[PDB]
């Protein structure tokens, strides 16, 4: 047979990502995880970001970041 091109892994949750401008993710139920979203602002890809060390707002938004429900 082939080289097995149909992995499975331990995917037992509702984890998913939300396309837009950056790379974000969210998962609540067992995995409990999420990928930050678009930073402060940029022109080409990098420029102005959010310092979660000084501003807690970025942190809350990062953990709150989740996919659409429509």
From Swiss-Prot:
Disulfide bonds join 21-38, 26-66, 36-62, 39-49. The keyword RNA-binding does not apply. Coiled coil: none annotated. Keywords: Developmental protein, Disulfide bond, Signal. One of its GO terms (biological process) is suspensor development. Expressed exclusively in ovule embryo sacs and in early developing endosperms. Disruption phenotype: No visible phenotype, due to redundancy with ESF1.1 and ESF1.2. Simultaneous down-regulation of all 3 genes by RNAi induces embryo abnormalities. Maternally-contributed central cell peptide regulating suspensor development and correct auxin distribution in early developing embryos. Belongs to the MEG family. This is EMBRYO SURROUNDING FACTOR 1.3. It comes from Arabidopsis thaliana.
